[PDB]
Design an enzyme around this catalytic site. Structure first.
Site, PDB file in Angstrom:
ATOM      1  N   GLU A   1      53.694  74.477  60.639  1.00  0.00           N
ATOM      2  CA  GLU A   1      54.625  75.058  59.587  1.00  0.00           C
ATOM      3  C   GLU A   1      54.681  74.612  58.420  1.00  0.00           C
ATOM      4  O   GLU A   1      54.233  73.596  58.028  1.00  0.00           O
ATOM      5  CB  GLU A   1      55.495  74.692  60.663  1.00  0.00           C
ATOM      6  CG  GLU A   1      57.006  73.689  60.356  1.00  0.00           C
ATOM      7  CD  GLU A   1      56.358  72.365  61.383  1.00  0.00           C
ATOM      8  OE1 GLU A   1      56.188  73.521  62.274  1.00  0.00           O
ATOM      9  OE2 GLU A   1      56.449  71.972  60.945  1.00  0.00           O
TER      10      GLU A   1
ATOM     11  N   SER B   1      58.758  47.843  48.098  1.00  0.00           N
ATOM     12  CA  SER B   1      59.349  49.188  49.284  1.00  0.00           C
ATOM     13  C   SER B   1      59.972  49.764  48.597  1.00  0.00           C
ATOM     14  O   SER B   1      60.637  49.004  48.446  1.00  0.00           O
ATOM     15  CB  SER B   1      59.996  49.140  50.515  1.00  0.00           C
ATOM     16  OG  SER B   1      58.559  48.517  51.210  1.00  0.00           O
TER      17      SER B   1
ATOM     18  N   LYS C   1      51.920  62.483  51.769  1.00  0.00           N
ATOM     19  CA  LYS C   1      52.172  62.788  52.955  1.00  0.00           C
ATOM     20  C   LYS C   1      50.392  63.345  53.209  1.00  0.00           C
ATOM     21  O   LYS C   1      50.524  63.204  54.242  1.00  0.00           O
ATOM     22  CB  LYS C   1      52.593  64.300  52.848  1.00  0.00           C
ATOM     23  CG  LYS C   1      54.480  64.489  51.890  1.00  0.00           C
ATOM     24  CD  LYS C   1      54.177  65.291  50.633  1.00  0.00           C
ATOM     25  CE  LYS C   1      55.995  65.759  49.910  1.00  0.00           C
ATOM     26  NZ  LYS C   1      57.353  66.052  51.199  1.00  0.00           N
TER      27      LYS C   1
END
Lengths: 316, 315
Positions: free
Chosen positions: A95, A302, A73
């Site tokens: 947030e 993947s 991330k």
């Protein structure tokens, strides 16, 4: 779902991005900014044991499967903060639910010297001292949200009120699975990173461009990523292997072809593949028989070889 | 702990490994074998925002903090499997609990081409059983053990008779946080790949040998492996920094750690283990000492988690 108030701001963003998409720079910059930072680039693994079931070709596996959760991330979030710098903004807000996306942003924020404010509901704050402190070591200001019901949605608006009022200097950085996702082109484009890294690494490990780049296509997005750096290469075939059953060639692969490819990766290589990717290994394998000796096939592994295992051990 | 009947056999591994230790051919073959597999080589990051707080030396951070553990067990297990292959042993056995060690062991045997049999307790056979499938998917026989207590002890004893039994072709392989650790020269030598790899990376990225290579000493035996490879580079300075052979030793104050730690967080967005923070603190110092442009390399080793608590309080 999107306060019409956010429309001019999202539009200014979408607008600056397009401008960025005009050429290779922005991704180029991103690529350089991730290098060695948090898992990029991922390794491109030459599977020499596999060569003998593939017509004496050389199969290279582009290990997307070794990314772990949010180093990934972070790599996603850094491009979003690199867009703020290029847009000229000097603060980033976001947030955060349980606090994971706040920790990612707070990280990129600080990698790039940007101020950083993360909004999070009072309920989320009390039970998450640890991410809140991560965030705080990293430098951001963590704003415990005490309105409505002190939950996630709650954070989301306070951030929207913030972003509306502060658009001159402030980039809003989206990422909670329950939060907003207003910018899909961006999210697709970042995955081209996968292509750029394979193109470099293939040139490094084999000394030329591949004879074919390959992925399982029918799965969401983020396999497709491997292709785009290669579109321009007149010599490079690009093949998208589709999960059949009973500019890119689409070709089909059967439930069997993929399982033989699977167990054959487990045994020859010690790597346990996503089912998704087995289709692609299967096809890489078809392809190399069919292209013969010293063919160079890059394959996208993947994703997440965690039980498709369930399924695989039934298959046998 | 170790049955005596094993001694003629432990010795032979010991003789053989002592042979491949000494030699350059081993750790390069294990380097090749583990290249691009499960997380090796690990990244060398130029932390260019430290430069300002380091006489504008250039500080490269050897990122052992990025290692998923688990991809660490494979990496450690690949070396025994590599060693087994070089004795001319053709099959490998081991034991396991939840069966993490057996997964890795199976993994490196698939990769290496070795038959593999893994001993597991009947009971953990039962409570833990895709791992058992994982293993089988990797092609190893799992012998689910149905003998006395049906657990790890008995799971070690089968393994050991098999071992004594098939000495001639069977290697046995450990790592399981409870069963036997007979080879401690080995566990320590295999961290050596960290310097090996750093030494190839810092010449690619910086054009030359480093001015200094720096690490945290009196903790986590995992740090020091970055030095061996620079031993024969006289005029790479080696600095081991301690909490307060060719290697100099130097102390770091609680305080100095946490300035580096804080800073590592605010400038690079990297959150270290407190131990790593001692090295960074030492690298900063060294930089100012050594000057504009020095190239300095740091093992950031250890998990940047739950030093977090400690760090938050501290501020």
């Amino acid at each position: 779902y999107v306060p019409e108030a956010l429309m001019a701001v999202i539009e200014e963003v979408t607008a600056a991005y397009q401008k960025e998409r005009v050429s290779q720079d922005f991704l180029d910059d991103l690529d350089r900014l991730q290098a060695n930072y948090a898992g990029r680039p991922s390794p491109l693994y030459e599977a020499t044991r596999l060569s003998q079931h593939a017509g004496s070709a050389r199969i290279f596996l582009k290990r997307e499967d070794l990314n772990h959760t949010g180093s990934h991330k972070i790599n996603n979030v850094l491009g979003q903060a690199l867009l703020a710098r290029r847009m000229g903004k000097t603060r980033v807000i976001a947030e955060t639910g349980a606090g994971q996306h706040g920790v990612a942003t707070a990280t990129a924020c600080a990698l790039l010297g940007l101020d950083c404010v993360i909004y999070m509901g009072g309920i989320d704050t009390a039970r998450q001292a640890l991410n809140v402190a991560r965030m705080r070591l990293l430098g951001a200001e963590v704003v415990a949200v005490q309105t409505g019901s002190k939950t996630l949605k709650d954070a989301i608006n306070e951030a929207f009120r913030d972003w509306v009022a502060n658009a001159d200097n402030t980039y809003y950085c989206f990422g909670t699975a329950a939060g907003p996702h207003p910018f899909p082109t961006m999210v697709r484009d970042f995955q081209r990173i996968i292509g750029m890294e394979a193109r470099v690494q293939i040139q490094g490990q084999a000394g030329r461009l591949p004879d074919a780049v390959v992925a399982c296509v029918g799965g969401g997005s983020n396999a497709i990523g491997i292709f785009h750096a290669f579109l321009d290469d007149p010599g490079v075939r690009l093949v998208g292997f589709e999960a059949a059953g009973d500019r890119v060639d689409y070709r089909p692969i059967t439930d069997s072809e993929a399982m033989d490819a699977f167990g054959l990766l487990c045994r020859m290589e010690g790597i346990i593949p996503a089912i998704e990717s087995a289709h692609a290994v299967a096809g890489a394998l078809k392809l190399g028989v069919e292209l013969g000796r010293g063919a160079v096939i890059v394959v996208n592994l993947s994703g997440r070889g965690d039980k498709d295992v369930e399924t695989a051990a039934k298959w046998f």
